[PDB]
Design a protein around this ligand. Structure first.
Ligand SMILES: COc1cc2[nH]c(C(=O)N3C[C@@H](Cn4cnc(N)c5ncnc4-5)c4c3cc(O)c3[nH]c(C(=O)N5CCc6c5c(O)c(OC)c5[nH]c(C(=O)SC)cc65)cc43)cc2cc1O
Ligand SMILES: [Ca+2]
Length: 225
DNA sequence: AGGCAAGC
DNA sequence: TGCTTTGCC
């Protein structure tokens, strides 16, 4: 019902590509319909609408994202996250519950990974005293996407990584059977090893991990030991 | 530009 | 397992 969303829906729909829609949907295990609009085109179509309408007032940004989240085609959720990025300066700790909602609604790796290391990563850098109100809850929830959020919110931190916290989180989730948890553990360890390889190596040599997780973690540093 | 990052 | 095509940085 928001005019910005109505305009975006019309403009995206007018530029759909049925020939791309099928393999795009298959790539996400057919969890979602697709219009068939890949990222470069999608972002330019969004730009078109912003250039016509101007960016809506920040009082509207949650409403816009919610309405886009409810549309059937997956590009509307990807575009909602592109839009959320344009309100970056207005996003703060009071928005964590909204981000939780997005993580657990129409969940898959494409949306969850686009929410977590940027938006939640930045919030918890400014408010690290709020981590304990969320991360333990997420780990205990048995929702795999909140669990993956606990693992990956520090993914881009590099020298800012809280090492003891990262390793505690990983230890809590290492016995998960879930592909998306085993793989997230491998990813965050591999990535942090680009910054602090010796402590990742020590960790993986002295703490239990699923074999997927361990192999992925040491992919680039194993030839140094 | 190009290296590094789910599907099967 | 190690290749795919597309996306992030
Ligand atoms: C913080 O740091 C990082 C964050 C990151 N996010 C991503 C990311 O979000 N990715 C990377 C890449 C998915 N991806 C691709 N290639 C690889 N080799 C990958 N290895 C892992 N993932 C991979 C990808 C996304 C997200 C998406 O939402 C994606 N969607 C598609 C997609 O839609 N694909 C990929 C395969 C595919 C399509 C597609 O549109 C198609 O429509 C034409 C396709 N057609 C076919 C065929 O007929 S094969 C005969 C394959 C095919 C790829 C894709 C990368 C990335 C990197 C970082 O450092
Ligand atoms: Ca792989």
């Amino acid at each position: 019902m928001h005019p910005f969303v109505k305009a975006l829906q019309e403009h995206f729909t007018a530029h759909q590509n049925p020939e791309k829609a099928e393999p795009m949907a298959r790539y996400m295990k057919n969890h979602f319909l697709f219009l068939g609009i890949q990222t470069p085109e999608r972002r330019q179509l969004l730009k078109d609408i912003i250039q016509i309408h101007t960016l809506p007032d920040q009082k509207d940004f949650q409403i816009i994202i919610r309405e886009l989240w409810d549309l059937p085609e997956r590009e509307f959720q990807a575009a909602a996250l592109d839009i959320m990025q344009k309100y970056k300066k207005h996003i703060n700790e009071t928005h964590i519950p909204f981000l939780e909602e997005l993580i657990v609604t129409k969940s898959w790796w494409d949306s969850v990974d686009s929410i977590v290391p940027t938006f939640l990563g930045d919030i918890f850098l400014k408010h690290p005293e709020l981590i304990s109100a969320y991360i333990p809850k997420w780990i205990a929830s048995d929702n795999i996407w909140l669990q993956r959020a606990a693992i990956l919110f520090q993914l881009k931190y590099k020298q800012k990584m809280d090492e003891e916290l990262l390793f505690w989180i990983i230890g809590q989730l290492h016995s998960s059977k879930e592909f998306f948890i085993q793989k997230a553990i491998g990813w965050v360890l591999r990535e942090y090893a680009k910054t602090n390889p010796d402590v990742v190596w020590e960790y993986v040599q002295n703490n239990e991990l699923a074999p997927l997780s361990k192999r992925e973690a040491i992919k680039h540093i194993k030839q140094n030991y």
